[PDB]
Design a protein around this ligand. Structure first.
Ligand SMILES: CN(Cc1cnc2nc(N)nc(N)c2n1)c1ccc(C(=O)N[C@@H](CCC(=O)O)C(=O)O)cc1
Ligand SMILES: CN(Cc1cnc2nc(N)nc(N)c2n1)c1ccc(C(=O)N[C@@H](CCC(=O)O)C(=O)O)cc1
Ligand SMILES: Nc1nc2[nH]cnc2c(=O)[nH]1
Ligand SMILES: [Cl-]
Ligand SMILES: [Cl-]
Ligand SMILES: [Cl-]
Ligand SMILES: [K+]
Lengths: 284, 284
């Protein structure tokens, strides 16, 4: 029953070192990897997350440009900025920090980012490439980070029974697609699923990205399961937990991500890696 | 208990009559819906399929342009034809009959079709739109036809435990995505799945697209299951069957598609519908 923590904090640190070296090379070729981040309005969490992303860029040799736009910006004004960034050869990645204001249509904004700078992998053509099984185009950061974490621990996915809880565009759908591409059998469950346990009790691998504290319990899993917790939930006490009942589920798991320090750091690492990927594409 | 045949042949015929009427009105306003079909080489099955598509177009007032190219044409020649068709305002849909010869890159050819005439829904941006749960593209004809057939019987998909056997780009992947969009829990099984029957025995709905005679047997399903058979397999005897053991599975099914006369006719009907949809878009 020897449980192993999937230490995304440690892996993300290793990746940042790797990127710092890549960036030294790129800079010697006259390429300064650069991520533009657009933050709209004054959402407090968003401020903090963007600051973290900028700090992570600086640590690994990526130039960051943060654009602080008014909460009342019109949709066309936001599109105009993205158009500018799309044509700026010095910018390799463009990220729009979510959530946008209620009066902005996310899907239209995201499709307006040039697909060659779409480091979140949200553009419809990048979604399409991934679903076609092509995994050289930009892949979304959170599920890509999960795949990299699993690969680092030498976890073989072929033939595995995998369950993804949550069917979001940001995580659940691309996560299922990456696992299917890797040869796993995949089930995608969500709030309308009649009985989650029917699926989870048979699973070799469970990815939980459902936004609900203690959604995954020990009686819902079999011994030896690999558990990946994408959840970030703040309790009334201020304690951060995932979507998994970690204390009990960890007892039954062969490998499990802690929260904090699991998926979270890996998502940032992949943002960085995707930006460096775009920058490297500029080499002759 | 009562079993009902999901009669795709009858539904398809009604759709064709509906499109013939729509095309009479379109033609009176100067638009003649037109599909270009490109067939490379002389694969006998392919020639049969193309003749079927051309016949169906004629039945519902769609003009067909069939380009029958030599198997030895270059990738460049094919691209050049598709470029011409992309720019021909009198052509509303472009379909390339698969498979292509080995020396032609399928992915490149499909992405070269302008997405607004991509009636097969294979272009990466159309795959992306579907996966994002958007309605701004073309959807692939086989899974779309399955959804239309289910809807014709008012089959409620929310919360259903669905299993899709086969993870192809033509059927399985978009099928799973359409079912997930409709609120079903979806499992995608394939050649690397350890125990297919574990999944099928619990399913409310099974879509089979595996190309294997008698893959789905009665001991693999529960009473009341809905079974959709995308297979078209020709026996030694000459009789056409699906991937389902229809004689036995039908006894346990609440709804089941016969073969022939189930999915097959609907796939063609959706091609015609997608073509007319494109033509209707071109109105001033
Ligand atoms: C894992 N994760 C963190 C994550 C990863 N990449 C990001 N990328 C960007 N550009 N912005 C983010 N806030 C972001 N966040 C997630 C996961 C799910 C949802 C999500 O589904 N939230 C919204 C959808 C999108 C939104 O935030 O507006 C919702 O429907 O409730 C958001 C972030
Ligand atoms: C699990 N999940 C999706 C998700 C789905 N349904 C939900 N439902 C509820 N009620 N609450 C949620 N938080 C929730 N979350 C997540 C996971 C992480 C983050 C998150 O940390 N997002 C930060 C940004 C993180 C980043 O920038 O990468 C944000 O502000 O959106 C959001 C949603
Ligand atoms: N173009 C094309 N479309 C399809 N839809 C279902 N099968 C096929 C095929 O072989 N080729
Ligand atoms: Cl959900
Ligand atoms: Cl974290
Ligand atoms: Cl048929
Ligand atoms: K009946």
């Amino acid at each position: 029953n020897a449980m192993t923590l999937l230490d995304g904090k440690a892996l993300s640190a290793k990746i940042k070192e790797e990127l710092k070296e890549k960036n030294q090379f790129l800079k010697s070729k006259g390429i300064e990897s650069c991520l533009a981040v657009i933050l709209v309005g004054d959402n407090p969490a968003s401020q903090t997350y963007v600051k973290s992303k900028a700090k992570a860029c600086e640590e690994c040799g990526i130039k960051s440009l943060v654009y602080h736009l008014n909460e009342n910006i019109t949709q066309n004004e936001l599109l105009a900025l993205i158009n500018t960034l799309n044509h700026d050869d010095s910018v390799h990645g463009i990220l729009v920090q979510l959530p946008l204001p209620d009066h902005i249509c996310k899907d239209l904004i995201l499709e307006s980012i040039i697909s060659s700078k779409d480091v979140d992998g949200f553009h419809p053509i990048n979604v399409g490439y991934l679903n076609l099984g092509l995994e050289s185009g930009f892949l979304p950061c959170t599920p890509l980070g999960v795949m990299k974490l699993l690969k680092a621990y030498e976890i073989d996915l072929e033939g595995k029974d995998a369950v993804i809880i949550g069917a979001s565009n940001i995580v659940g759908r691309p996560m299922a697609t990456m696992l299917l591409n890797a040869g796993a059998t995949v089930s995608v469950c969500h709030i309308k699923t009649k009985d989650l346990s029917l699926y989870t009790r048979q699973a070799d691998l469970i990815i939980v990205a459902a936004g609900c504290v203690n959604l995954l319990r020990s009686d819902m899993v079999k011994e030896g399961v690999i558990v990946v917790d994408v959840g970030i939930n703040r309790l009334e006490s201020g304690k951060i937990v995932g979507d998994v009942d970690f204390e009990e589920v960890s007892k039954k798991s062969s490998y499990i991500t802690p929260v904090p320090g699991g998926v979270g750091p890996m998502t940032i690492a992949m943002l960085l890696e995707n930006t460096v990927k775009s920058a490297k594409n500029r080499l002759n």
